[PDB]
C-alpha cells in the first residue's frame, strides 16, 4: 500500500502536511502497514519520477491519494483502467493548484500553436480574460 | 495481440480518422503483423470506453497510435509507466484539434473556479486573448 501526496510548487509545502496527515489517518483506521508515504512536488499534468517509480512497480497494489487530482488533473480513469488489468488500484480518501494548472496548460498549448517566445505571457493574459464574465 | 487505435475529438473531423487508419495499417503491414483498427470519437482528456476496454485488457500488449496526443493530450508518460509494469507498451507510428482541447480544458477549469454558469464563454475569451 503506497500513500501518495502531491503539490505543484514548493510554496504549497503545508498542503503536503494536510495530505500526509489525512493519508495516515486513512491507513491507521484500517490498521494497515505502510511501505511508502510518498511526497512529490510536480505538475498536475511535467515529469514526476516518484509516481513513475510507483506506477512501474507491480508490488504497489494499492495507491492511496487524498483527492483524484493529486495523482493527475487529467487521465486518472485511464491509469485505473491500465492498473485494473494487473489487479492494482487507486484509492481516493476524500471526494488549490488549478489556476496555476490553467497557466501551465495554456503556456504549453500556446507554445505548440504560436511558438515558445512569450507563450507564458499569452497564457497570463488569457487566464486574466477568463475572470470577468 | 497488437491494437491499432485512432481518435478524433468531434464527428466533424471523421476525415482525420481516415489518415490515422491508413498510416496505422501501413505501419502494421510493413512488419507483416496480424491486427486484432479501433476508431474512437472523444475528448483528448472526457470518457473514452473503447480506450478503457483496450487498457483494461491485459492481452493488448502493443497499443499503436499515430501521435502520442491521440492516446491522451496529458498523462501518456504515466500510462506507459503503469503498462510497463505488466510488460505492455504504447507504440508511436509518427512524431490540430489542440484549440478545441484548449476550450475543453479552460471550460472545466473555469467551472471549478467560478461556477459552471458561463464557464465556456470565459474559456472562449481566454482562447481568444492567447492569439495576439
Residue numbers in the entry:
A (entry chain A): 52 to 96, 98 to 147, 152 to 189
B (entry chain B): 51 to 86, 88 to 96, 98 to 147, 152 to 188
From the paper:
TnpA binds specifically to the transposon ends and is a member of the SR family of DNA exchange enzymes, which are most often associated with site-specific recombination reactions. The SRs found in IS607-family transposable elements, however, are distinguished by the location of their DBDs at their N-termini (experimentally confirmed below). Although there is considerable structural similarity between the catalytic core domains of the subunits, the quaternary structures of the TnpA and smSRs dimers are radically different.
The TnpAISC1926 subunits are shifted apart by about 3 Å relative to TnpAIS1535, the TnpAISC1926 D helices are angled by about 15° rather than being parallel, and the TnpAISC1926 B helices are one turn longer than in TnpAIS1535. The active site serines of each TnpA dimer (TnpAIS1535 residue 59 and TnpAISC1926 residue 74) are separated by 28.6 and 31.5 Å (Cα atoms), respectively. The E helices are interrupted by a four residue β-turn (GRRG in TnpAIS1535 and GMRS in TnpAISC1926) and fold into an antiparallel structure. The split E helices from each subunit associate into a 4-helix bundle, with the C-terminal segments of TnpAIS1535 helix E rotated 35° relative to those of TnpAISC1926. Cysteines were substituted at TnpAIS1535 residues within the catalytic core and helix E region where they would be proximal and oriented appropriately for intersubunit disulfide formation. F126C, located just before the start of helix D, and Q138C at the C-terminal end of helix D efficiently formed dimers after oxidation. Within the helix E bundle, L162C generated substantial amounts of covalently-linked dimers and A182C generated a small amount of dimers after oxidation. These solution results substantiate the dimeric structures observed by crystallography. Nevertheless, we show here that the quaternary structure of the catalytic domain is active for assembling PECs, as evidenced by the robust formation of PECs by IS1535 TnpA dimers covalently crosslinked over the core subunit interface.
